[PDB]
Structure formats: C-alpha cells, structure tokens
Design a protein around this ligand. Structure first.
Ligand SMILES: O=S(=O)(O)OC[C@H]1O[C@@](COS(=O)(=O)O)(O[C@H]2O[C@H](COS(=O)(=O)O)[C@@H](OS(=O)(=O)O)[C@H](OS(=O)(=O)O)[C@H]2OS(=O)(=O)O)[C@@H](OS(=O)(=O)O)[C@@H]1OS(=O)(=O)O
Length: 142
C-alpha cells in the first residue's frame, strides 16, 4: 500500500527495536496496552510535542491518551490527567527514544518489568523506541 507524504496521516507507531521481542505499542479500545508484532490501527499514535521535550500521546482508534500510574503501569484513558498522561521524551546517544513520567520516573515499556529513568545509568533495551511512520491506508481508520 504505497502511501504519499500527504496520506499517511502523520501517525506514528512506537516500536521496541532493541528488545529481545520487538513490538509496536498498542492502545486497545478497552484501554489495555500491549504490543503488536506489526502495525495495526490500534498502534497508530498521534504524538503531540510540547515545549521542553514533553509529549502527549493518543491512540487514534481507541480515542485514549497513553497514561501511567505511580507504579509505572501504562494504560489508555479517555480522560487526560496531567499527573499521569504527559511524558518526558528524549533521544539517547544511541539514537533511540525513551519516554518517562516526570513525576514517577518510570519508563514507558510494554511488559511487567518496570524501570525508572535515573541519572547515571542506561535504560534497558526493552524501554527503547523507534518511531515508525504509519503505513496503514487511512480508509482503515473508522
Ligand atoms: O527485568 S528482567 O531483568 O527480569 O528482565 C525482563 C525483560 O527482559 C527481556 C529482554 O530485555 S531486553 O534485553 O532489554 O530487551 O526478556 C526476558 O523476558 C522475555 C519475556 O518473558 S516472559 O516471561 O514471556 O514475559 C523472554 O523472552 S522469551 O523467551 O519469552 O521470548 C527473554 O528470554 S530470551 O532471552 O529471549 O530467551 C527474557 O530474557 S532473560 O531470560 O531475562 O535474559 C524483556 O522481554 S522482552 O521485552 O520481550 O524482550 C523483559 O521485559 S518484560 O517486561 O519482563 O517482559
């Protein structure tokens, strides 16, 4: 499905390129967040950039904001809460990206192992992301 620059929707799929098992972050209609081996309409995200490297991420099809609780668990919420739904984004020296809670420090990741982004150490491979341009034709979104 060859798409033009004016037909991919500006949507991005976050892929755990360096993890042992790589997936695209998926936000389901019910708010559950997991991984999809290949791009799906539910892994298509709108990543809104703000100042100072902060971002607000929304799953286009689920209509939910990516949020995180105090334990680092991520989920999709229909309601935006600044204490849980805004992340600090940053590109590491190795070229991959990480997203972490400015209040809880935990890194966004797909599995049960939650790790805090702390100064003086490197984040684990499973928490590193690569932004992949959406390749799913827009007719599939709704
Ligand atoms: O926190 S831990 O130190 O215990 O590590 C857990 C995370 O380790 C990974 C790899 O991390 S990475 O190196 O940064 O990429 O892999 C480990 O767990 C997976 C998933 O296990 S699970 O029980 O099904 O959930 C194992 O993969 S698999 O064999 O099940 O397919 C890994 O085994 S293997 O090396 O692939 O053979 C296992 O590695 S190890 O034994 O700890 O060395 C992350 O999983 S990953 O994201 O799928 O790559 C783990 O993250 S997780 O949140 O725990 O799932």
């Amino acid at each position: 499905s060859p798409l033009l620059g004016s037909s991919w929707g500006g949507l991005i799929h976050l892929y755990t390129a360096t993890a042992r098992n790589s997936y695209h972050l998926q936000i389901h209609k019910n708010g559950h967040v997991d991984g999809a081996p290949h791009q799906t309409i539910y892994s298509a995200l709108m990543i809104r950039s703000e100042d100072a490297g902060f971002v607000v991420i929304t799953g286009v099809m689920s209509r939910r904001y990516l949020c995180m609780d105090f334990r680092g668990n991520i989920f999709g919420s229909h309601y935006f809460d600044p204490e849980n739904c805004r992340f600090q984004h940053q590109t590491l020296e190795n070229g991959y990206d990480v997203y972490h809670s400015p209040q809880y420090h935990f890194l966004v990741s797909l599995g049960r192992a939650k790790r805090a982004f702390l100064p003086g150490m490197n984040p684990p491979p499973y928490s590193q992301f690569l932004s992949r341009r959406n390749e799913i034709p827009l007719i599939h979104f709704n």
